[PDB]
Amino acid sequence: SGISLDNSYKMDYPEMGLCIIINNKNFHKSTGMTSRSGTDVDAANLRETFRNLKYEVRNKNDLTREEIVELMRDVSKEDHSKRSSFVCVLLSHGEEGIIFGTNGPVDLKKITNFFRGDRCRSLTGKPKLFIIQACRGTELDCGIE
Amino acid sequence: HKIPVDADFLYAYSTAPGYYSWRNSKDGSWFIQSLCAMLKQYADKLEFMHILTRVNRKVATEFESFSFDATFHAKKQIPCIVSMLTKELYFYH
Numbered sequence: 059s060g061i062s063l064d065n066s067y068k069m070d071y072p073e074m075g076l077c078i079i080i081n082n083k084n085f086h087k088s089t090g091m092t093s094r095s096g097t098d099v100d101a102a103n104l105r106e107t108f109r110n111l112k113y114e115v116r117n118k119n120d121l122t123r124e125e126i127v128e129l130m131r132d133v134s135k136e137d138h139s140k141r142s143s144f145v146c147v148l149l150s151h152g153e154e155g156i157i158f159g160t161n162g163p164v165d166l167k168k169i170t171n172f173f174r175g176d177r178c179r180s181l182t183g184k185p186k187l188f189i190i191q192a193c194r195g196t197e198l199d200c201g202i203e
Numbered sequence: 204h205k206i207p208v209d210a211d212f213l214y215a216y217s218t219a220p221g222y223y224s225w226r227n228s229k230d231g232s233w234f235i236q237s238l239c240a241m242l243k244q245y246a247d248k249l250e251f252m253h254i255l256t257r258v259n260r261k262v263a264t265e266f267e268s269f270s271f272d273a274t275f276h277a278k279k280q281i282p283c284i285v286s287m288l289t290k291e292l293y294f295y296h
């Protein structure tokens with residue numbers, strides 16, 4: 059063959075990768091949080107977009123901090139051998155480091171950890187992508203005109 | 204032989220750390236609105252980080268919050284690309 063560079067991920071596996079989208083809209087009276095509106099458009103949008111990107115989209119609505127974790131633990135346990143990647147979209151309320159299940163908070167590290175190079179063997183060397191639509195605190199960018 | 208276990212992860216944050224993340228009750232969130240726009244327009248042209256950078260300017264320059272409440276009125280937002288990837292990323296091939 060010829061010189062072999064490799065500055066880009068092998069994205070020609072039989073499958074582009076499964077894309078998980080968690081669409082939390084409604085929260086338990088207790089959390090003291092209001093429902094997010096508009097999120098259903100967001101969620102529909104990503105599905106259409108990732109569907110065009112040959113991604114195997116799985117929308118998961120209003121998940122509890124517990125179901126998010128099981129979902130992840132379970133999805134991470136899957137065999138991603140014939141897949142080029144993994145996308146995961148978390149649509150919800152948040153704070154630096156955490157995103158809220160419908161009943162409580164989940165640590166971004168707690169879930170993205172199921173996919174660490176040593177805990178998700180069939181994804182090691184492959185790009186794990188996490189898109190996050192949630193607050194990372196409560197600061198406001200008054201911007202500069 | 205070995206590689207970081209936190210290696211090959213990409214974090215696309217809708218906002219800079221500590222700030223609010225805007226969402227419009229009708230059209231959706233600024234971020235995902237702008238993320239889907241850019242993906243369909245370039246997923247087959249640009250490398251992922253170049254896409255997300257267009258996504259950053261779309262949000263930054265095109266959106267600005269309207270609100271009856273001074274506190275939340277006229278705010279901007281800048282998504283945050285956090286990459287621990289070790290190679291370029293093109294959804295096409």
Ligand SMILES: *[C@@]1(=O)C(=O)N([C])C2=C1[C]=C(S(=O)(=O)N1[C][C][C][C]1[C]OC1=[C][C]=[C][C]=[C]1)[C]=[C]2
Pocket residue numbers: 095150151152153191192193194223224225226227228275
């Ligand atoms: C943010 O995601 C979060 O974690 N929390 C508690 C929260 C967040 C964003 C929003 S918002 O997108 O609605 N918006 C941006 C900051 C203030 C707020 C103002 O407008 C608004 C209020 C109620 C419904 C819809 C829009 C809210 C809460």
